Structure formats: structure tokens, C-alpha cells
Symmetry: C4
Subunit: 358 residues, 4 copies
């Protein structure tokens, strides 16, 4: 597998163009694994078009200070209200793999989410993180010893939250991967450390009782990731979740489902401040960060655009994408009259009943 290896900063004009650019340097199979989605990708398109359902108003300012994008989540002060989403197998995008992404995320000043299906060992990731904050993403194993194992791993790795991904009991119908007959070219050292001698995908099982078990034994706040329905959010909190991570997995799971942003207000209204909300699935612009905040998210998580940046320039390319989002958000703050992230949470959005074609 001939992944790119060049390390360089990139001039990000917008994140959409990074997809086609990365397609020229990433092997075909791996690129389509990253870029593709379930079915004919209608729900991936819905994730993108949902942002046109609620529109920003330019507005007058009420404060004289320059804008400040910093915020805090679970006690971590971060430079901007976005974190890195947990994504498997960064080596499909770049030879420096998860260590490269971790270096970009740590140097930028936000939180790295580590997929249990990382292609890098934690020691490799730890070198890139250089002490930066990290959260650990897990799937629910049928074998409860494996859950005890991975929770111990997360604690030993300095994780300050667990991300329990609920929406991946089985894979989505990812037509690109089926047609390409795609096969992972490398292993999963973190899960293999624990599975050796005891099928990896088939080891995973979630219900409210599962959430309760993980929350009771992790010693860390647990986000439940993949929530799209408000009653699930309520049930997850009552079962002990310390956070709700609104997501459809980048449209890589259930097909013919809503665009993720369209589900956020109903969830936020039901959560009603009880726990923090992370929002993902389709964030491509600073305007999207702002809209998610205005709609009840505390932070968003970034995914594909960062991986495409990693493909194009390693840690410096991924850093360029994070820098782009921070600068893009700053512009949106100026033009919406917002001085800080809290102001963005208070924005009034214009409801567009016409949708994408207007």
C-alpha cells in the first residue's frame, strides 16, 4: 500500500477541494474507503445539504474586543470549538498515520480522539501527541473481558473520556468498498494486543444496559456516539452517559436517514444542558461550526477534511486544515457580531424551507 509520505503545509481555500486533491495521491481503494458512504451516498449529501436549512444572519456587534475562538470541554481548554473525530486506519491516507494526525491536533491545541481500530500503536500516537489531550473510542465487545481490557488500555493511555460508538453493530452498505473489494492492508495493533489468542469486527455487539456497564466501569466520562433520535439521548443519559455525540458516522452506516445537522435541535432540546454535546457528520466550513453551536452543540468533531489534509501534507497538511477552520470561524464571528464562542451559541438562524435548490 503506497500511501503518501510528504510533509508540507497546504493553502486551504475550502475543504471540499481537498477531496479531489487527495484522490490524486491516495491509492484508489483506500481513498474510496475514506471518501465513500452507504448506498448511493444520498445521506452523505444530506449531511452536506442540511447546512442550507438554517442560514446565518450578518448582524451588528455589541462588544469591542477582537474575536476569541477558545472554549472549554470537560475541563480541557481548547483553541477552537472543534476536536478530532475518531477515525480508523489513518495509514490509508499517509505513512505517518495516526501519529501525524495527533501531532497536528496537539500542536493546534485541541483534543485527539483515538479509534480502537487505529493502525498505529499507542506509543506511536503518543509521540505525536506530545502530552496533548486524548479521548479513546471503543466498540462494545460481546466478550466482556475485552471491554475490561480496552477500558484499562484507555486509562493507561491517559484518556480523559471514553467515546462509546453505538451505531456500528454491523457495517453500512458501503458500495464503493464492495465494488472495489477493498481490504485493510495493515493491522489493528491496539485491539490485537488484547485479542491475540482469544473476527475482530465480529467481536463487537448497544443497549442502555451496555451504556450503564461502560459508564460504571470506565472511571471516565462516557460519550455515546451515533445518536440521532432524542429518546435515545434521554435513555443514554439516564443510563449514565456523561456526553452525547450526535453523529451518523459520516453517513457510513445507516442509509436513507436524515442529514445529521437536521437531527441536532431536537436532541439538544431533550438533552437540555444535562451533558455536553459533540456534533459531527458533514462539518466542512466555519459556518457549519457556528450553526452547530447555535443549535446546541458544545463542540463539533472534524473527520474527512483532516484526513484529506493528512494525505496531502502529513501533520502539516492536517494542521493546515485545523488552521483553516479556526480562521474561517473567526470570519464568521466577525460578520455575525460574535466576540466569543458563547456568542455563537446565542445566534438566531434563518429557517430556509426551500432547502438546497432555494
Amino acid at each position: 500500500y503506497n500511501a503518501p509520505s510528504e510533509i508540507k503545509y497546504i493553502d486551504v481555500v475550502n475543504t471540499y477541494d481537498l477531496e479531489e486533491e487527495a484522490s490524486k495521491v491516495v491509492p484508489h481503494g483506500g481513498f474510496n474507503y475514506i471518501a465513500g458512504a452507504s448506498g448511493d451516498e444520498w445521506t452523505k449529501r444530506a449531511n452536506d445539504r442540511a447546512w442550507k436549512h438554517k442560514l446565518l444572519y450578518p448582524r451588528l456587534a455589541q462588544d469591542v474586543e477582537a474575536p476569541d475562538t477558545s472554549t472549554e470541554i470537560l475541563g480541557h481548554k481548547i483553541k477552537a470549538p472543534f476536536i478530532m473525530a475518531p477515525i480508523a486506519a489513518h495509514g490509508l491516507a499517509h505513512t505517518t498515520k495516526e501519529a501525524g494526525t495527533a501531532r497536528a491536533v496537539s500542536e493546534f491545541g485541541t483534543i485527539m480522539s483515538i479509534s480502537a481500530y487505529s493502525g498505529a500503536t499507542f506509543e506511536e500516537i503518543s509521540e505525536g501527541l506530545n502530552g496533548g489531550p486524548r479521548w479513546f473510542q471503543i466498540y462494545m465487545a460481546k466478550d466482556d473481558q475485552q471491554n475490561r481490557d480496552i477500558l484499562d488500555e484507555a486509562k493507561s493511555d491517559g484518556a480523559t473520556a471514553i467515546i462509546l460508538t453505538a451505531d456500528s453493530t454491523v457495517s453500512g452498505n458501503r458500495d464503493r468498498d464492495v465494488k472495489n473489494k477493498f481490504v485493510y492492508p495493515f493491522g489493528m495493533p491496539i485491539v490485537q494486543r488484547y485479542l491475540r489468542g482469544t473476527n475482530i469486527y465480529g467481536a463487537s455487539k448497544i443497549s442502555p444496559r451496555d451504556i450503564e456497564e461502560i459508564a460504571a466501569h470506565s472511571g471516565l466520562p462516557v460519550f455515546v456516539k451515533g445518536i440521532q433520535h432524542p429518546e435515545d439521548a434521554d435513555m443514554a443519559i439516564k443510563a449514565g452517559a456523561s456526553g452525547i455525540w450526535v453523529s451518523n458516522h459520516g453517513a457510513r452506516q445507516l442509509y436513507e436517514a436524515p442529514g445529521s445537522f437536521d437531527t441536532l435541535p431536537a436532541i439538544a432540546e431533550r438533552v437540555n444542558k444535562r451533558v455536553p454535546i459533540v456534533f459531527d457528520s458533514g462539518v466542512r466550513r466555519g459556518e457549519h461550526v457556528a450553526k452547530a453551536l447555535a443549535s446546541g452543540a458544545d463542540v463539533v468533531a472534524l473527520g474527512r477534511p483532516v484526513l484529506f489534509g493528512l494525505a496531502l501534507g502529513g501533520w502539516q497538511g492536517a494542521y493546515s486544515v485545523l488552521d483553516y477552520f479556526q480562521k474561517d470561524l473567526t470570519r464568521v464571528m466577525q460578520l455575525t457580531g460574535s466576540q466569543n464562542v458563547e456568542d455563537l451559541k446565542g445566534l438566531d438562524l434563518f429557517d430556509n424551507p426551500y432547502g438546497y435548490e432555494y
Copy 2:
């Protein structure tokens, strides 16, 4: 007429691609007879786009068991909540014609619907069915002796329900067939057995009084097929129908009518459990099966995708399509938190007022 004859399993990634694939092996006229629809096909497109009006939520599970797709209708236990729709002239798709479809349907474990306009004799179909359950579809004849004849045929053929198709008093404005000057290359042996010596299309007449007559004399439960309006459903039940088959005939009849799925909730609310509902016209994915169930159908009927599978691989190709739907539905069950078909009937759907372009 040089229909395909090869028998093989096929790797179904999605059913949409089967249309173009079948177009390469089926003679032009017959293929466009199968694939085409009335007018400029806007209502066929509406049947397809209607599925984006109600979207599935991924949700947490409440049961530990593996998913089970089986269900029961009119006392028949079937492997999945879909049956074969009655379709004329399977010999346009494959030399093994209705016997090939019947073998796939019986081996899979669901119900075969036999069109009165079959190109195969019942003995030919019976060999494929090998004892499997079958329903018999009829049109209302103007000559009441022909109705007595075909009801006797159905009983002699072991049918356990009659499908009275109401929406075909005359043909739809099927532009493809007119422009191709298409002509059936073979006969209709089942109707000819009774019509000989006594114009076939012109023999057919329906009103509530017709439904009452068929229901009173068939000795079998009667589904009325082609219903799209709730008041017709109520009238049909009051006239003695034992089932409502919501359908627009695959958009092959009335043009500039709604997509069939959009009509289902209003019908289901009016039927209000009185009789079983079969839904068809546009089912292409497991998500569609689930949405129909959640909207009040007891089972769906499959049509064009199975015929395209038959064209590509005979009974094994048709079987591959049925297998695809069963596996696709299983995935949807996992991701919606559903353990069984009854759970699917209880799903909450997201209303998408933006329609297809979102």
C-alpha cells in the same frame, strides 16, 4: 425472441444496477416493456423518490437476540416480509420464465404471485414451485363465466389467496412500448385454456359490487390490488375484501399520480388493522421494506428487481435478489435497534419536508 437462458447466482450490490445490467442481455423491446412506465415516467421516479420523504433513525437496541426477518401472512410463515408481485410474461426476461421465478421464490421461502397473463402453463410453474405457497392474480372479466373459470383454475392450482387487480381497466400510456411498437412474442396459456372458442385484454372490465362478487364466489381471501386512496380501501373492505394491496402497478398505469409510498399511511390509518396490507411499487432496498412496515404494511411485494435478476441468472439470479433483500433488511434491523419484523412496524420515521434534493 432471444431471451437469456444462463442460470447463475449474481453478486447483488444494489438492485438499481440490475436494470442497466439486464438491458445488455434482454431484447430491446421486451426490456423496455419491463422497465418502462407511463408518460415520461415521472410517477415511476416519484415511487423511487418517495422513500426520501420519511427517513430512518439509527437507534439503540432493547433486546439481545440476533435479528429474525421471518413473519406470517394469512397463515403462511415466510422467511422475510416480502413476497413476489404478480408480473406477466416472465419469458421476456428469461427462457425459464415463471418457472424460474417460482423456483427462486419457493427455495427462498416466500409466496409466489401468479399473473393470469403468465407465459408459462401452471404445470410449468408448479414444477418450479415444488409445493411452495402461491396466490393467483386475476382481472375482472366482463363475461362472468370467465370469472367463474379463473376462480376454479386458482382453486385447482392450490392458490391460497386471490389478487384482484383493479387498476388495469385499460393500459397506461406506456410511451416506450408505443414507440418500440412492442408486441408480446408468446401466448397466455392460462387465459387461453378458458377463452378458446368464446380480445384477451378487451375481455377485462372494477366497482365495489365486482369486489363483492369475487369475494363471495372465490372461496379464498381476496386482496384488492391498485388501491391508492383511503376511501377505496374502506369500500373494498366493506364489499368483502380480505386484504388491501397498495400499489400503482409500478407506475405502469395512471400517470401524474403520487408515488405509491406517499399514499400508504393514509390507507393504513383507514384500514386500521381490519385486513392485512401488502405494499408495492418502488421497493428497491431493505430500507424501503422497513419504511413500508413502519408505515402500516404487513409485507411488501417485489417486482422489477426480481425480474432483472431472472434475466441475469435465471432462478439463481432471482434467488440472489431475494437473498440481497433479506440481508439488506437484516442490516437495517441491526442499525435501527430492531430484533424482529414486529419491531420494524414500531419505528419512528423522520419527516423530510425538503424531498429528494434536500
Copy 3:
């Protein structure tokens, strides 16, 4: 000007295809005069797409008789619920001009509307009409003697109604005609008979007072044509109109206005049976005739499709288009459970809030 001259019947599969077909035989300038509309034609497209806003239901029959398309308007029994719209300069489409259209309309058995801007003399039209019913369309002249003149002409010509076109005070912004620098190649003998010695387009002025004047002096029922707003319909009736002709002139006048069919229900509700309603602007299918009837029109008027038929086959080609509409409507009647034109007035339409893309 080299207009087609061939006379032949044509096999009409749909009326949309007649446009491109006619473009191959009609001189470029004249063809684009017939086919074009104001601005970028968005409102012509709206006239067409409006039909997808209200959808037909297939439904059970309640009567045993074969369908009958006949109806009556202002005492004239006509073979089907459509008449010929007043259209200028039929010689742009065919050398037999208005006489050819009149022969088709009379032989079919409906009403011919004669534009004051006919290229044929009345004697020429009269030969084609062969005694068939005719209505006379006028514009309001600034010179009231010209109004007295044309009303006398209409009476002498056997007209049984006047069509007062209100929506043409000035021409629409017809980009095709401006860019083609189109110029009428022949004269207007009917208006010239009266204008000689007394600038034709500039002779025309309407207000409720104008309607009152025409209705008081015509000796015939007056339809006011071009109505799109209900308050205008009420004002026109109170001023003495004997009919309301809902129309946007085939989108050839005001741009960025609604599709004509979308305006019909509000007008019909306000008219509330007081006078007959003629509907036009975008009728292309039997389904459109049915929908207009169900929405409050007594008849529709046909325009461009008949002219395209005339271009392709003279009176026999125009006849073929009328025959197509009658047969198309008959099919729609069968499938909607309608035995006669009154049944069509009682149809329940499905409201499609998604519009054209569904």
C-alpha cells in the same frame, strides 16, 4: 416565409415531442415566436410543472357505462371538454393557417376561437369551419369606434361569445423574438378591414369599466381572458363578464408570475359557479384536462400543441392532436373511475408539497 404545407395525420404519442418535431419544419423565426415565452421562460416551465402539484388518484368505479367525454358550454354540445385557444398568425405554422385549424376543430366537434390578429380572412376561416361554432377574441382599442367595428365583425361572423383579452396591454419580454429580430411576414386582414385610413399593436388599451362597456354593447357573452387573481375575477363578473378565462397567455406576457394551474382553485372558489370558467396555459396531457376540471374549470383551451400539429400535418395534423387529447382523457377517466365529464369535476386530488423534484 416558407411555412410547411403538407397535410397528413400524425401518430401522437405525447404532445411534448411535437415541439421539437415542428422545429424541424417551421422557419426558425416563426417557430421561436410560437414556442417562446417571456424572460428565460421560467413561468412557461412553471405552467408545466404546476401539474405535479396536484396528483390524480386511481380509484374504483361506481358506474357500469363506458366513458363519455362530451360536455356543454354556453349551449354548445362539444365532443370533449376542451376548445381551441385564440392564437394569432397560424400561417407561421402552416400555409393553410387558421382555415386548417378551423377545419380540424370543426371536424373534431368543438369550438374555434378566432384571434383578431388572424392572418386569414374570415371568409378563409369560414370555409374551414363549415358551420362549426366560433368565438371571437378581441383586444380593447383606445379608439372606441374600433371596438364598435370589431364587435360588429364578430356578430356578422356568427360568433357566439366574445373573448376580451386583458393581459396584453403591451407585449411580454419575449427574449427569443428580440434576439431573432422576428417580424410578422404577413398582415392581419380582419383588423386591417377596420383600421385602414384611420400602429395596430399600439391601438390597444383593461379596467372593469372597459369590461362593462364591452359586455353592454357586444350582444354576446363576454369572457375576460388573462385572469390570474381572484379579486379580478369578482370585479370582472360584477362589471358584466359572462365568463372567466383563467390564463397567463402561455407565459408570453408577465414574467416571474405563477404557473397558471396554481391560480385556478382560488379563482374557482371566488367565482363560485357564477359564470363558466375556461382554463388555459400549459395543457399538454389528458391528465391536465382532468385536473383542471377537478379544480373548477368547465373546459380547458388548447394552444401550442395544436399549432405544432398544424405545422406537422395541416388540418389532419391538428385533428390528430385533438384526437390524442380525447383518447388520453378517456384513459384517465377509466383509471380515475369516472364515467363522464361531471365525474371528473368531482375528483379528489393529492397535494404534493414537494413539487416537481419530489
Copy 4:
């Protein structure tokens, strides 16, 4: 920089075609500076498509007089209800730059808006204006001496209103300019007159307190430009604004915001006659002028179409565009039954919930 220099009248059929025509004579970088907008231009498209959300009705007349497009704003009688929007750097379009635009605007008989970022000196503009009315557009400087300077400039230049642009604290994300690496080829003499010896873009800061300061010290009525939210309109008036200028800067500022016309009714309802409203951002047709008037604007401002006319023909080309709008509006008046600009303010618009695709 090789700007066009030819002076000629042009035959304007519609203003949309002027864009492509100007692209053939304006240098690539400057043309894309004029034509482009933020992001992928979705909000520029929204400005255009918003006009299809409210549709005009053709209607009967209630007055006998010929239409009159004149109106009055802030005591200035103008020939038609549109003015020239403030636009920087007209020299990108034509060598005669702002003097050419000013000559067209003055000769036509409306108000010229002068951007503080003009490429022409005021003396150059004054020659073109030849005494015609002018308003002066400013940005809020951080250095309050610069605000005192520019307000003195405006008064010395005979300005009769100040346009305080609020929506440009920083530049929009104008992808065309970033990708073209566009750089202004000439200077800004008006701002340089005051900035010399005391970074131009970075000199600009607005809040209600800023509006109050400008309104208290200008000696002239102050319009606040860039308003899209009603509460900002109320706050601006309470702070001393004498006018509200509804605008999104031609979509050159905040991305993923509404089309400007969609924001106008809510603003007009809140302003509730307190001060005049100027509307801009997307006006391309006489129908748009009429719709803005009917929705609460007193006049509209024209932008890109006039600059494209200037590129194609200098002052005579810009004049041709103004003449086009006046003639186009006259047609719309005739067909809506409107005799004067006040009648246009009273029009009833058809609400189109289907949007652009209908």
C-alpha cells in the same frame, strides 16, 4: 491592467447575459473580482432564486393614465425607483471608471453612491456627475480622526446622505479572488488623501454606538447598509439611522446566509415606515424592482449589471442598463395594473412554497 475603453450604447435584452459578455472584455482577475461571491456562491444564487419565492399577478387596471416610474427619496425626485449602489474600483470594468458610471447615473436622473474605495478622485467623479445627486459610502474607522475626515470629505463633496456599510468588518471568503491571487492594480485616492502619513482595509472597525456616533456628527441622514435581521434594523433606527439599506453586499460577505430578498418583509414590518428602506443584492429585472417595492422597499440599488454595462460601453453602456431597467419596470407596471410607483407598493404577491424548481 488593460480595462476596456470603448464608449457605446448596448442593446440590453436582459442583464444576465451582460455577465458573460463582460467576461470577454474585462481582464480575468478584475472580472472575477466583480462577478464572484463568497464560498461556492450558493448565497449569490440564493439572492437570484429568492425572486421566485414571491410571484407577480397580472391584474386589471384602475386608472387611465400612462405609467410613470418617477419617485422621490430624501427630497430627491428620481426618474425611476432605483439608485446606484456603492461599488469600489470601477476602473476594473472600464478606463473611465467611476466618472463613467456617474455620467450614466446623472444623465439618467437618479442618485450616485460613491464608495470610499473609489479608484477615481472626487474631482474626476464630479465631472461625470455634472451636478447630479450623490450619496457617500463609508466604513467605520478604528481611528476616529479618519471618521471625522471622511465625513468632512462627504460634506465638501456635496453628499446628501451617508451610507454606513456595516457588513464588511472583514472580507468575505471570496474563493475566486483567493485562487486568482487578485490584487488591486490601482489606488484609492479618496482614502489616501486622509490616510497619508498616519493597512487601509485594516483601518476599518459596527455596533449601535458606532451608528449613533456617525449619525450625530455627519450632518446628513445616515443609511445603515448590510442589514438582514429585523432587530438590527430597530437598533439602528434607535441609534439615529435615517434609513435602512437591506443588503448582503451582493453575497460578497457572509456565506450560507439567506437570499437578500427573503429578509426584506420581516425588516420592512419592523421598520414600519419609520425611515426609508433601500433594498439591494440580486436585482436583475424590472420584476425584481416591483417585488421589492411591494415588499416594503422605497427604492432598490443596482450593482453588478451596471458595472457590466460600463465594461461593455462606458457611460453609454451603463446608461443602457439603467434605461433597460426603466423600460422593463414600465412593462411590469402595465401588466400588473399599476400606474405609478405607489401602486407597485400595493401589489399582492403570490407565495410560491415550491421555490425555484417549482
